[PDB]
Amino acid sequence: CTTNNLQVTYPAPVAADGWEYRLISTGLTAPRSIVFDSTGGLLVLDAGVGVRRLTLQDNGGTCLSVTANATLIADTALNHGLAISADGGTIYASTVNDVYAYTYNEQTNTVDPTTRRTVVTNMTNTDHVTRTLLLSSRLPNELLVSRGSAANEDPQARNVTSGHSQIRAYDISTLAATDPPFDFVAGTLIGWGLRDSVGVGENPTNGGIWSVENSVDDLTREGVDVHQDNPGEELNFHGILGNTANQGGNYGYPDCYALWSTAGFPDLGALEVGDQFASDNATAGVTDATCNTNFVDPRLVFQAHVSPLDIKFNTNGTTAYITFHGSTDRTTPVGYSIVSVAFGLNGQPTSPMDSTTAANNILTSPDLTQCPDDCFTPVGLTFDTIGRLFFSSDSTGEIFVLQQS
Numbered sequence: 110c111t112t113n114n115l116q117v118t119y120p121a122p123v124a125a126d127g128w129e130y131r132l133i134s135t136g137l138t139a140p141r142s143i144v145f146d147s148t149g150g151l152l153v154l155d156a157g158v159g160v161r162r163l164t165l166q167d168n169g170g171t172c173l174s175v176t177a178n179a180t181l182i183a184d185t186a187l188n189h190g191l192a193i194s195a196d197g198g199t200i201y202a203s204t205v206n207d208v209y210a211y212t213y214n215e216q217t218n219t220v221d222p223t224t225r226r227t228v229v230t231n232m233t234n235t236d237h238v239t240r241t242l243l244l245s246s247r248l249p250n251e252l253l254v255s256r257g258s259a260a261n262e263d264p265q266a267r268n269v270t271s272g273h274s275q276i277r278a279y280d281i282s283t284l285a286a287t288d289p290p291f292d293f294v295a296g297t298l299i300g301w302g303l304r305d306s307v308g309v310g311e312n313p314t315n316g317g318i319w320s321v322e323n324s325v326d327d328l329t330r331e332g333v334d335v336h337q338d339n340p341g342e343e344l345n346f347h348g349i350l351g352n353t354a355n356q357g358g359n360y361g362y363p364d365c366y367a368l369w370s371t372a373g374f375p376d377l378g379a380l381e382v383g384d385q386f387a388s389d390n391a392t393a394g395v396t397d398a399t400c401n402t403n404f405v406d407p408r409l410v411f412q413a414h415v416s417p418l419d420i421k422f423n424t425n426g427t428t429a430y431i432t433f434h435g436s437t438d439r440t441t442p443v444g445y446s447i448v449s450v451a452f453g454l455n456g457q458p459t460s461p462m463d464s465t466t467a468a469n470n471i472l473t474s475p476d477l478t479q480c481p482d483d484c485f486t487p488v489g490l491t492f493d494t495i496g497r498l499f500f501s502s503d504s505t506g507e508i509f510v511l512q513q514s
């Protein structure tokens with residue numbers, strides 16, 4: 110079954126009925142985004158090291174072993190994002206300021222450092238420093254890049270030209286060898302008002318673009334501290350690449366936040382779960398009505414502070430898997446899990462926007478009071494060619510495989 114028998118060092122994750130998993134790699138520095146190359150190797154963005162390639166021996170199901178590891182790219186500035194071209198010959202990886210493209214030699218499984226070129230630049234800011242990369246499947250030359258806020262409440266997120274808290278799309282086919290990288294704000298605007306939407310994914314049913322949001326910390330409502338269960342994390346819809354419908358809007362940060370818990374909420378009015386409301390620190394003139402009329406509400410909301418970091422859809426588009434990295438801004442911890450959300454034939458969640466039960470648990474921490482110290486912190490997801498799910502846990506240095514049994 111496996112060459113080595115890696116065991117977790119904390120109360121082990123609990124698999125929902127029908128699911129099984131196995132720990133397949135340990136001792137990584139800080140694994141973030143992951144993706145398979147064309148030769149069946151697993152590329153890992155190990156933050157603070159670079160891009161590592163894990164050689165896997167596959168005996169079927171969860172019976173996988175790492176037999177070797179190689180550092181393809183050594184660059185301590187790479188901190189999260191990673192993508193590979195459809196043809197398998199170009200690796201993309203980002204620092205806080207730039208998105209780099211490297212030529213990957215699939216024959217030798219090596220990257221010549223001198224082939225590196227910058228494709229997007231000027232992304233640097235403090236606080237939220239990850240630059241998530243997604244290459245479209247439907248439009249394989251379209252690269253999306255996510256960029257969060259410079260503070261918990263960043264005023265410059267009100268200025269679209271600042272580049273803060275937004276998702277941009279770049280046609281990489283239009284980029285000559287001679288010409289320089291795009292400026293971050295030169296890309297197509299997928300959305301702004303997105304505090305730190307680290308997770309971005311493409312639904313194969315119709316090509317819909319989806320993002321998951323890490324919402325504001327230490328929320329007050331009419332001065333009252335309501336942060337324990339507000340605001341909700343969010344699933345945001347950005348329409349479809351190569352069209353403008355439902356795309357480019359302002360998702361509300363930092364003037365509007367989405368409602369998770371209605372109990373004890375000051376001035377609830379006619380607000381429902383999922384509706385956005387004005388922040389106590391909203392710019393002068395913004396009210397709850399402004400949030401309803403001028404800003405884009407989330408398609409779904411999730412328990413406050415779960416901190417989602419990735420969203421990946423299955424081949425069918427019937428299910429999206431999301432990593433909940435775990436709370437730091439709540440008294441009892443929440444998250445520390447992998448959940449699924451069901452999607453219908455029109456490419457939308459089957460749950461309504463006021464659902465509090467749309468996230469279905471797949472892998473959960475047995476005892477949330479032990480998190481984060483004794484729990485996994487899921488970050489990146491990726492599917493192999495046969496539908497098995499692989500995910501990283503950055504805090505624990507692990508890679509796991511997950512499948513139905």
Ligand SMILES: *[C@@H]1O[C@H](CO)[C@@H](O)[C@H](O)[C@H]1NC(C)=O
Pocket residue numbers: 230231289290291292293
């Ligand atoms: C990056 O930003 C600087 C300062 O605004 C700008 O002058 C420079 O041209 C930008 N780089 C690119 C390639 O746009």
Ligand SMILES: *[C@@H]1O[C@H](CO)[C@@H](O)[C@H](O)[C@H]1NC(C)=O
Pocket residue numbers: 262325326327328329330388389390
């Ligand atoms: C609003 O700003 C105040 C003062 O900076 C802060 O204490 C409070 O947490 C903020 N409320 C939010 C983020 O909802």
Ligand SMILES: [Ca+2]
Pocket residue numbers: 323324325326414438
């Ligand atoms: Ca948060």
Ligand SMILES: [Ca+2]
Pocket residue numbers: 302322343360361362365366367385405406407
């Ligand atoms: Ca929002």
